[PDB]
Symmetry: C3
């Protein structure tokens, strides 16, 4: 085969992407999503327990009573909140300092840094090489371990990546410290609720093949889109649906493509195709006059414009549909959801 090398690399990357246990849940299976979530939760709690019980001595000598006593007691209010806020702020500052030192050593012309920085850089390079072939606590382990958050609620390329990560961590830490300082005055007196919403619907009588996603943005409240898939016929249908201000006669309304007529037009388009089994058309006709089944909602952390771009890229890209739209139907749905969520990055 003289056309199966770059596609082979892309396919291998796709298979690695789809191999994770708790990533890319099956859109048309609530049980699979529940299984993935429960498995992730179990491993998360087990890892926190292991890292809590692991040291318990150097942690005790560094910041022992401050976090352990509060966690054991909470497992009055103003004092506990102040102590927890101070401990969280000092943890974030310490992480900032150590990653900043690592970054400054990374852009320190490593053939010139001192012995300790050379040792640390070599250790991180060994970590990267081990991960490439395949007592660790990045900083989130402590915060998720002692239930702090729960009760509060060329080598220069890797150098640049680590610098960007350190800058992001510093910004998050500064925001958290400002929030805790504000919370202290209240007692003395991660995005949420703005993420895009994806609802997964499926036509009743042949939902294994035909389904669609309805996506509604937030903090705009007038932009949405419809993305419909039929896998027996290999048909993908996109349309943006919004709401403008339209005056009919002497009255105002929001003249935009309604979801209902969107779904009806998609069904009509899927009916007129020669590859129908002379009964698939019958199923689509029967399902044309009934409300589609709601099959749950998925939420993530990505801008709505990014989702629009990803959907439009899926629609008019040939090799992307050569990759994600060939295979078993379960793999089909998983690859479609992954491509929608991550875009073209799913292949390399």
């Amino acid at each position: 085969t003289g056309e199966s090398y770059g596609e082979s690399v892309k396919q291998a990357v796709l298979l690695n992407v789809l191999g994770s246990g708790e990533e890319i849940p099956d859109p048309l299976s609530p049980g699979e999503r529940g299984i993935q979530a429960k498995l992730k939760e179990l491993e998360d709690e087990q890892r926190n327990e292991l890292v809590r019980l692991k040291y318990n001595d150097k942690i005790k000598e560094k910041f022992g009573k401050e976090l352990e006593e509060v966690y054991n007691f909470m497992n009055k209010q103003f004092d506990i909140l102040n102590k927890a806020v101070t401990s969280y702020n000092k943890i974030l500052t310490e992480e900032d300092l150590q990653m900043r030192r690592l970054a400054t050593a990374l852009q320190k012309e490593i053939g010139e840094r001192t012995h300790a920085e050379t040792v640390m850089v070599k250790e991180y390079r060994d970590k990267i090489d081990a991960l490439k072939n395949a007592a660790v606590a990045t900083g989130r382990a402590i915060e998720g371990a002692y239930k702090l958050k729960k009760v509060i609620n060329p080598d220069n390329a890797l150098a640049v990546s680590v610098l960007s990560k350190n800058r992001a961590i510093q910004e998050n830490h500064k925001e958290l410290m400002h929030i805790k300082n504000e919370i202290l005055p209240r007692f003395k007196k991660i995005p949420r609720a703005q993420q895009p919403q994806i609802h997964v619907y499926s036509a009743p009588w042949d939902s294994d093949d035909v389904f669609f996603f309805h996506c509604i943005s937030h903090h705009h409240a007038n932009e949405s889109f419809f993305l419909g898939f039929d896998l027996s016929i290999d048909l993908v249908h996109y349309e943006d649906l919004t709401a403008h201000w339209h005056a009919l006669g002497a009255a105002q309304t929001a003249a935009g493509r309604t979801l209902t007529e969107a779904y009806r037009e998609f069904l009509n388009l899927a009916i007129s195709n020669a590859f129908g089994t002379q009964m698939h058309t019958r199923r689509l006709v029967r399902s044309k006059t009934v409300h589609p089944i709601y099959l749950g909602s998925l939420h993530y952390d990505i801008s709505f414009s990014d989702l629009r771009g990803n959907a439009q890229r899926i629609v008019y890209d040939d090799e992307l549909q050569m990759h994600i739209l060939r295979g078993p139907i379960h793999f089909q749905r998983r690859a479609i959801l992954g491509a929608l969520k991550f875009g073209c990055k799913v292949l390399g």
Copy 2:
């Protein structure tokens, strides 16, 4: 998709009942059952290990505090007595670490213990197995009451039959008369053929499966009184608002919804 309140809230509650990975496995697929059983086992044993870990840690901390007081005052009686009280309390708390908790386990066995729990057998036709299957439900502590519930999901076909046998007099002899599994299955297939919404290839597999005994795929025992199971079988074969949710959707969802409805009657929605 214009439906104000009703269908929306029923489908929401149904998804929330089916949104958990611990309960209601797909009966047709023993792999999902194994995954769910292992997941249950890991949750329970890790909660046991967590409570034992916490109680041993707290008793060790109490002992170390007593030791440190002894060390720092050697060169605490009111503390020693409170320490002994705490140690006795912690030993009592940590005694049930060997998983000897049967009261919570038997709390659901108020009237239905083991060897009295009703059995459910899952059967499937040999060829279009993913779409057609049925349950043979047998009761214990009676050995005389049983029923048949058959679903052909592609065509939207549901059949219920009552296989209860009873004493009968035949001349100068006696017998146990009543419907039996073989003729129930054969009549169900016979009724499935004459439906108008066949596929002229689905019918071929059905008629070929009419001459072969069904395939046994396991048994399930759930904490539902067999009288209640019969009641749910009556509701599922009679009512239509319940069916309009349970019998519409992807096949894996449809089968899980059917198992859930058989388990909880009409409690999955509302």
Copy 3:
């Protein structure tokens, strides 16, 4: 309840083999393989941590007992001797936190090391993928042996074909004569197309599948002798009741049974 008790015992043995959720993943869906591997890893980690908890709690119990005895005596060295022995044992056992010996090499593989094991690639046709699919099993430490095993579970056909390349002389020149995997695939598809049990729309998909390379769904490897794989493939092909038990049922369970029979030949069936 059906026809025979030998068939039911064989089926029960097969269902118990497939009952576990940590073994015999679905060969076509890599998500299932990932889930099963992660569950197995979590289970082994929990096993090791339970062992470590037992170790640490017994060490702490001995240390606390020695400390309490010393504290009671303090309120010569003869009494402190057991405490010193406990301290020595605790230090020795704490410094022995290693489970990394080469016994784990036979504790997990027990048959063959790395780079001396066959690998099974899995492909499926692009369009009707969930039914037609094949395994390309290529071995190691024989630079010329491999084989092909293809399945079409819609019309229930199994095909096997060796792809071994023997040295051959043609004219006054030499070649490594075997079968091309592409030629094997096209002959398998041609066999599937000309089957009388055609849907007349399934054939237009096999025919479309002929002129495009198949999709690579992944590669896996199990520690079994390659000759055993050859024997198991001809066992799958040339047995009647093995086909009747493994190649009948739900598609998911069918594929799991196929992988299981590749794993164990007929010992899985009993």
